[PDB]
Design a protein around this ligand. Structure first.
Ligand SMILES: *[C@@H]1O[C@H](CO)[C@@H](O)[C@H](O)[C@H]1NC(C)=O
Length: 382
């Protein structure tokens, strides 16, 4: 009884998507998987759906990270107003960023990318960066944020994703006098905007590949598992890094992204250091800069524990290689959206059913019923 998820091009293409260290290959919470010219550079190959940078400027401020980043200091404003958005104008006087997707389609041409995410990544990948200190052109690549509501593409000249600690930044104006307010990445689900954060390297090769290669969506009525003993066995309390209750599935979706063990390239140590300058837009690359490579607790199973009446978010850190179809369960990642897709259909006419071994008169049977994957227990003592 072989893993049917390797048994078919369509099943194998679907499972491959969830091999995150392979297909993404960089941090997810904070992505700093590359370095160039001495700076940490955003590097993952997969778009990160719903990723926003939460800021903490005092109440009167805009506190919107898609705001123009500052072009000059004002020593008299602490913290300095601004977001992460690249604020350069073209010599025509048109802004670099944000740009309407409409226009990008025009500017990329007849053979440009067929997805808004591919366009926005390519647009970033093509943008000639400029050192925010020396003021000289650089080979550094900016990350991007596509907003699927405004249909606008943003290129961020600020590539920093996580700034923390009262030595280095203010929360809501405390301590006072700090140049930078604090900030950290968060999954958001808002009706007003629908964000996708990515490195420019989404564009590299085929900018549209993410659609097919990456774990863009939650999987409905299925759990991530591991094939063993002729059966998909889902990850649960036994085999997870945490498995606390969640009030609802969206909370689980947010949790996996924010969880302390998610693949992340943030420095785990705190070098006694002076305050960042107003224009330290890019993290400096140090010999000890961590690279998760996208290994970590990046997957979450959301299910109703039959035993206890509670919904569980079971976050785990193994690459899964099958799905257990279970009605009402959801499989999430730190990369994907909370929007839900089905398991690939299944061909009932040819699909060969696979039987687990009999243990205590119950075996697990995987079949195709009405063209859908089915996993059930079956009595096997007469
Ligand atoms: C960078 O160029 C700007 C002009 O846009 C200038 O105001 C600033 O002093 C320069 N920064 C340097 C070279 O320190």
């Amino acid at each position: 009884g072989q893993n049917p998820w390797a048994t078919t091009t369509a099943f194998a293409d679907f499972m491959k998507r969830f091999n995150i260290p392979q297909v993404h290959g960089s941090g997810i919470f904070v992505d700093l998987g590359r370095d160039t010219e001495g700076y940490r550079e955003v590097g993952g190959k997969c778009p990160v759906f719903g990723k926003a940078i939460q800021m903490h400027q005092p109440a009167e401020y805009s506190n919107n990270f898609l705001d123009d980043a500052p072009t000059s200091n004002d020593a008299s404003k602490k913290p300095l107003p601004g977001g992460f958005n690249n604020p350069q104008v073209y010599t025509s006087g048109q802004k670099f960023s944000p740009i309407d997707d409409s226009l990008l389609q025009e500017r990329l041409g007849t053979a440009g990318p067929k997805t808004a995410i591919g366009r926005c990544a390519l647009y970033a990948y093509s943008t000639i960066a400029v050192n925010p200190s020396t003021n000289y052109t650089s080979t550094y690549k900016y990350p991007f944020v596509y907003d699927a509501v405004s249909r606008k593409c943003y290129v961020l000249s600020v590539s920093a994703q996580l700034l923390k600690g009262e030595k280095y930044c203010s929360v809501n104006g405390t301590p006072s006098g700090l140049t930078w307010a604090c900030f950290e990445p968060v999954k958001e689900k808002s009706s007003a905007r629908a964000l996708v954060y990515g490195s420019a390297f989404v564009a590299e090769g085929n900018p549209d590949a993410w659609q097919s290669a990456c774990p863009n969506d939650a999987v409905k009525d299925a759990l991530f598992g591991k094939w063993e003993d002729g059966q998909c066995v889902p990850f649960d309390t036994k085999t997870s890094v945490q498995s606390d209750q969640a009030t609802n599935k969206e909370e689980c979706w947010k949790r996996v992204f924010a969880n302390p063990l998610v693949a992340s390239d943030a420095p785990t140590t705190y070098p006694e250091a002076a305050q960042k300058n107003w224009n330290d837009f890019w993290p400096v690359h140090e010999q000890s800069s961590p690279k998760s490579g996208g290994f970590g607790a990046n997957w979450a199973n959301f299910y109703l524990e039959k035993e206890s009446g509670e919904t569980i978010c079971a976050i785990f850190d193994q690459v899964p290689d099958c799905f257990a179809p279970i009605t009402g369960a959801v499989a999430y990642t730190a990369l994907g959206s909370s929007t839900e897709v089905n398991l690939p259909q299944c061909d009932s006419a040819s699909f060969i059913p696979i039987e687990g071994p009999c243990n205590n008169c119950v075996q697990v049977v995987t079949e195709c019923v009405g063209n859908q994957f089915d996993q059930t227990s079956k009595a096997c003592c007469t």
